[PDB]
Amino acid sequence: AKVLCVLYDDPTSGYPPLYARNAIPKIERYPDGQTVPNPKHIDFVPGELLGCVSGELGLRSYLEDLGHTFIVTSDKEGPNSVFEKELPDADIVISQPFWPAYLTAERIAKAKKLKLALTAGIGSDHVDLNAAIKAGITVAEETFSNGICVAEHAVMMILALVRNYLPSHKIAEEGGWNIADCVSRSYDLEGMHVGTVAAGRIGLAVLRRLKPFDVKLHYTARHRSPRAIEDELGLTYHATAEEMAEVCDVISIHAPLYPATEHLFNAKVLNKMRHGSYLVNTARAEICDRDDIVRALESGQLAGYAGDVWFPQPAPANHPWRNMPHNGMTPHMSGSSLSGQARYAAGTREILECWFENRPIRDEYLIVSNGKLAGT
Amino acid sequence: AKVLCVLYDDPTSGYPPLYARNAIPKIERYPDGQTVPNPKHIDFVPGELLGCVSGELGLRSYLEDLGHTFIVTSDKEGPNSVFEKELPDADIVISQPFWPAYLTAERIAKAKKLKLALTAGIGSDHVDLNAAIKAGITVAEETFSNGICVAEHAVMMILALVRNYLPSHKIAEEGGWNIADCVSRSYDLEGMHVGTVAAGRIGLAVLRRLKPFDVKLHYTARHRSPRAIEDELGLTYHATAEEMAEVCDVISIHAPLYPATEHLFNAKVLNKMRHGSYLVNTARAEICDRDDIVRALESGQLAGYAGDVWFPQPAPANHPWRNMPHNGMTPHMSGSSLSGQARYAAGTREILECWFENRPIRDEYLIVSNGKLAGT
């Protein structure tokens, strides 16, 4: 078989990087009881950089030993790209949401040999599921593999914004002291009203991490959570984001992108919030209106914004979110911590082992299979 | 009476600063059940900048209406300083640990009218308690007033170090993307072994905030915590810091400075840790050996260090902690968040009301009173 795999570029200083440590924690299960991936073997030490071109998701020896062709590239843009040229006879396509090889209806149509579209990481935002259903192909993901990573990144961003960390660090490194400058925008999180948009796997992990900070917790969701969860965390439920925005000091977005959430956080919703509120978005950038976020930070309607997701990705050098006031942005990275990579690379291999051996792929990994959609 | 109060300098852009918001959460009590301060009135809106010279801890109208003299200055260094010149006839001296007016034995000796040494904030590190005991003076603090602030700052720093936040933000603001560079040192906190040095008011608050991150929790303390606390959090207790260092990936320091903890974290203890460990110090800088921390980060023995406390404070422009590798420093600021200031300024006023009206100061606020030491 031919496996066509798109990954991001190597580190600037070359591969492999100099690792800070030589081992990472062994995670056994996720908070809902789902087990971590269980491939028969892995050809990497967890902690290694796997998601770039030279890292190869740790798959090359495994695939090539079985006789498979493994093409790894970062060149995925346009019809003259390495990806699009190799696509017509690829049996399997693999990519990460951090550097995604889009499977549009048009590309699926010319992928004449395609049977498996495998996300390394979570979700399938870059794949046209309607086209996949009709083409009869399988679309799979390593469910939950980096959800905790994203949750941690979100809470880290919330604390950094509210406490004024980033400008204060700059003062330390630049030779200043200036206590009054540092604390002029520094608040405690304690006692604030904090809400999540959605309480799925990631949203719930965020809510649990926020609880001992003694905030008042809120959420909105299309499908309300069970009473037992709400009682556990002391959650207040809102039917809409607009209702939640009126009462929250901090909102963290953890919802998928679809028509009801596209440009959900525009000027209308932002202006429902109290002047000086905070917004964190580690979900999808298009859930916010890009320019409305700029204007809110320039006016002070938002005291701060942070996230790791951008519209156009990669963010062009001129993206306005880079230097808008009071931001805590990073490039798209949360789900690609070395810890997260170890799990999703292990799961990518687990799924390939099942596929090549004609054994069922875990039901929880399947997004579409043989003309059938798991969700909506 | 004469009240001599030392505070830090005004914001660079002038006083008052432009506030991000016009209200903050109303905190009613601390986690151990202690109530927040209860002065009869305050002359500020909680959220205001109070700890700089123009902020005056909100005390001027109150004091001057009663006929008291209120001298506020930032000039506290040496015998020709404003502080030392006004000291000989001051009845009351007030300062914050963020910009402390040292009451050495020598200064106490020449403070011929001194009766009350009041910390605005917590502790008394800047006061010679032996001299205070013999002089018969009262030393007081607003107990717990900014403990939660420090706890939040510590957890924020832990997450930022482990996930590689600070360098990744720089890449975003500088026009880069470079996913592999960002994640080359980015790990999840989940599953790591994390320990606190001490589990007092602040240490316990840190342990509680860490718990839902699903870390394995450790601590050391001169006085072990009750079994009920250990059972609550799943704590493993160590008799010494050296023992704890051998098993922890991350250590956060929350102990007072005294002979057993001075230079506790030197090369000997640091080398007991696994290569690539993390250390956070929001307690006292002298608990670490300054140059040993540098060397550990240069060798990689530590993957990261962060804190807001420095030896010499203010840190000179040439302090090696400012630009040592992989640091997350801020100036000394955690306990002076606007939220913390609202509580300690309210408590400073509560104590002064008690003092001037000949009513008892809360027992929990007293460090020494009439020749008697509360602790050791």
Side-chain angles (χ1 to χ4, degrees):
Chain A
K2 181 169 153 173
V3 177
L4 177 53
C5 173
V6 169
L7 297 176
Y8 46 74
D9 282 323
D10 283 355
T12 292
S13 47
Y15 189 95
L18 173 68
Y19 298 110
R21 57 171 52 226
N22 57 37
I24 59 171
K26 194 180 288 250
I27 305 304
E28 296 219 324
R29 69 204 68 156
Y30 299 120
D32 67 353
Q34 176 194 342
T35 60
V36 298
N38 64 330
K40 290 187 286 188
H41 304 94
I42 57 168
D43 293 319
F44 62 87
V45 178
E48 285 187 72
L49 177 54
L50 304 166
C52 59
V53 170
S54 299
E56 297 174 330
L57 296 172
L59 297 170
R60 184 174 301 280
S61 297
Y62 165 68
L63 289 174
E64 290 188 350
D65 164 76
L66 294 169
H68 304 300
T69 298
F70 186 40
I71 310 301
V72 180
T73 185
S74 66
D75 185 29
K76 71 200 188 59
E77 291 305 325
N80 209 17
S81 64
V82 172
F83 176 69
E84 186 134 355
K85 294 151 99 166
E86 298 292 349
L87 183 60
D89 64 339
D91 296 277
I92 301 172
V93 168
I94 302 172
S95 72
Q96 305 157 124
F98 319 103
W99 196 257
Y102 292 106
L103 290 177
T104 59
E106 290 56 54
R107 279 174 166 182
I108 288 175
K110 60 201 261 195
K112 192 41 222 156
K113 290 304 136 227
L114 182 65
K115 295 175 265 295
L116 175 63
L118 180 51
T119 298
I122 63 180
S124 59
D125 291 335
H126 61 289
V127 175
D128 185 319
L129 296 186
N130 290 335
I133 287 165
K134 288 189 186 187
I137 71 168
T138 293
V139 182
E141 58 169 352
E142 301 75 52
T143 305
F144 224 147
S145 58
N146 56 20
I148 298 306
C149 326
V150 176
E152 293 185 8
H153 217 77
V155 174
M156 174 190 75
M157 287 174 164
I158 292 171
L159 289 163
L161 287 181
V162 173
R163 303 199 60 81
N164 204 40
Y165 191 13
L166 305 177
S168 303
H169 177 63
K170 185 193 172 99
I171 290 170
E173 60 191 0
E174 295 199 329
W177 193 244
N178 302 80
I179 311 305
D181 289 339
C182 294
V183 301
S184 279
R185 306 177 54 82
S186 181
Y187 298 95
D188 294 348
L189 182 62
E190 191 192 19
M192 290 190 173
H193 288 262
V194 185
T196 61
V197 182
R201 290 173 178 99
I202 301 181
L204 180 59
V206 167
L207 293 166
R208 285 175 170 148
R209 284 159 179 71
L210 287 170
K211 185 177 180 295
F213 289 86
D214 284 338
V215 293
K216 317 290 184 25
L217 291 177
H218 298 259
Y219 79 118
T220 189
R222 216 252 276 194
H223 307 293
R224 195 175 177 162
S225 300
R227 180 75 64 78
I229 294 293
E230 294 181 340
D231 287 344
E232 165 194 344
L233 294 166
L235 304 181
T236 295
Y237 172 73
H238 302 272
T240 66
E242 285 194 37
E243 279 158 332
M244 184 170 74
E246 293 170 17
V247 297
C248 287
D249 298 297
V250 173
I251 292 182
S252 187
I253 303 174
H254 300 288
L257 176 74
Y258 60 100
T261 65
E262 186 136 15
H263 297 347
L264 180 58
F265 279 76
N266 59 10
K268 170 151 202 194
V269 173
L270 295 168
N271 292 343
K272 289 298 185 68
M273 300 191 84
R274 203 158 306 271
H275 175 97
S277 295
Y278 300 89
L279 185 60
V280 171
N281 182 5
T282 58
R284 287 271 69 125
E286 311 95 304
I287 298 177
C288 298
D289 182 278
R290 181 187 37 152
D291 296 347
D292 286 350
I293 293 299
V294 193
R295 291 189 275 267
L297 292 160
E298 285 180 1
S299 75
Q301 179 60 28
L302 287 178
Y305 179 97
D308 69 335
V309 297
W310 308 66
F311 183 59
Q313 287 196 185
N318 81 325
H319 197 292
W321 281 8
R322 294 182 181 270
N323 296 280
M324 65 193 23
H326 311 128
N327 84 74
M329 305 298 300
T330 65
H332 192 196
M333 71 182 288
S334 61
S336 211
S337 70
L338 298 168
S339 311
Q341 294 186 38
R343 296 186 295 269
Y344 70 73
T348 295
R349 174 148 177 184
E350 179 204 332
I351 291 169
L352 290 167
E353 290 175 349
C354 291
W355 184 261
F356 288 133
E357 297 168 20
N358 189 39
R359 290 187 293 109
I361 293 164
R362 297 197 197 187
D363 178 83
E364 63 203 346
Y365 291 162
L366 295 170
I367 299 169
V368 357
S369 184
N370 285 331
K372 306 314 262 190
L373 218 213
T376 326
Chain B
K2 181 169 153 173
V3 177
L4 177 53
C5 173
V6 169
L7 297 176
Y8 46 74
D9 282 323
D10 283 355
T12 292
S13 47
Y15 189 95
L18 173 68
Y19 298 110
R21 57 171 52 226
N22 57 37
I24 59 171
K26 194 180 288 250
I27 305 304
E28 296 219 324
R29 69 204 68 156
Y30 299 120
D32 67 353
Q34 176 194 342
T35 60
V36 298
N38 64 330
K40 290 187 286 188
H41 304 94
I42 57 168
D43 293 319
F44 62 87
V45 178
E48 285 187 72
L49 177 54
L50 304 166
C52 59
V53 170
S54 299
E56 297 174 330
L57 297 172
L59 297 170
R60 184 174 301 280
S61 297
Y62 165 68
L63 289 174
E64 290 188 350
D65 164 76
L66 294 169
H68 304 300
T69 298
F70 186 40
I71 310 301
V72 180
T73 185
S74 66
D75 185 29
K76 71 200 188 59
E77 291 305 325
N80 209 17
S81 64
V82 172
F83 176 69
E84 186 134 355
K85 294 152 99 166
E86 298 292 349
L87 183 60
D89 64 339
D91 296 277
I92 301 172
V93 168
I94 302 172
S95 72
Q96 305 157 124
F98 319 103
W99 196 257
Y102 292 106
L103 290 177
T104 59
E106 290 56 54
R107 279 174 166 182
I108 288 175
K110 60 201 261 195
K112 192 41 222 156
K113 290 304 136 227
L114 182 65
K115 295 175 265 295
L116 175 63
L118 180 51
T119 298
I122 63 180
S124 59
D125 291 335
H126 61 289
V127 175
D128 185 319
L129 296 186
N130 290 335
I133 287 165
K134 288 189 186 187
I137 71 168
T138 293
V139 182
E141 58 169 352
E142 301 75 52
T143 305
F144 224 147
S145 58
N146 56 20
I148 298 306
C149 326
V150 176
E152 293 185 8
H153 217 77
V155 174
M156 174 190 75
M157 287 174 164
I158 292 171
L159 289 163
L161 287 181
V162 173
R163 303 199 60 81
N164 204 40
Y165 191 13
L166 305 177
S168 303
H169 177 63
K170 185 193 172 99
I171 290 170
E173 61 191 0
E174 295 199 329
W177 193 244
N178 302 80
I179 311 305
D181 289 339
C182 294
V183 301
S184 279
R185 306 177 54 82
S186 181
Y187 298 95
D188 294 348
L189 182 62
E190 191 192 19
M192 290 190 173
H193 288 262
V194 185
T196 61
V197 182
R201 290 173 178 99
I202 301 181
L204 180 59
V206 167
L207 293 166
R208 285 175 170 148
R209 284 159 179 71
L210 287 170
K211 185 177 180 295
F213 289 86
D214 284 338
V215 293
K216 317 290 184 25
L217 291 177
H218 298 259
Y219 79 118
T220 189
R222 216 252 276 194
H223 307 293
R224 195 175 177 162
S225 300
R227 180 75 64 78
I229 294 293
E230 294 181 340
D231 287 344
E232 165 194 344
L233 294 166
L235 304 181
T236 295
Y237 172 73
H238 302 272
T240 66
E242 285 194 37
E243 279 158 332
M244 184 170 74
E246 293 170 17
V247 297
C248 287
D249 298 297
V250 173
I251 292 182
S252 187
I253 303 174
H254 300 288
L257 176 74
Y258 60 100
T261 65
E262 186 136 15
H263 297 347
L264 180 58
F265 279 76
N266 59 10
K268 170 151 202 194
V269 173
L270 295 168
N271 292 343
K272 289 298 185 68
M273 300 191 84
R274 203 158 306 271
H275 175 97
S277 295
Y278 300 89
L279 185 60
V280 171
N281 182 5
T282 58
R284 287 271 69 125
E286 311 95 304
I287 298 177
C288 298
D289 182 278
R290 181 187 37 152
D291 296 347
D292 286 350
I293 293 299
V294 193
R295 291 189 275 267
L297 292 160
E298 285 180 1
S299 75
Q301 179 60 28
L302 287 178
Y305 179 97
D308 69 335
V309 297
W310 308 66
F311 183 59
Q313 287 196 185
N318 81 325
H319 197 292
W321 281 8
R322 294 182 181 270
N323 296 280
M324 65 193 23
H326 311 128
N327 84 74
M329 305 298 300
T330 65
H332 192 196
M333 71 182 288
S334 61
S336 211
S337 70
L338 298 168
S339 311
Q341 294 186 38
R343 296 186 295 269
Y344 70 73
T348 295
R349 174 148 177 184
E350 179 204 332
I351 291 169
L352 290 167
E353 290 175 349
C354 291
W355 184 261
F356 288 133
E357 297 168 20
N358 189 39
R359 289 187 293 109
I361 293 164
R362 297 197 197 187
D363 178 83
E364 63 203 346
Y365 291 162
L366 295 170
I367 299 169
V368 357
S369 184
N370 285 331
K372 306 314 262 190
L373 218 213
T376 326

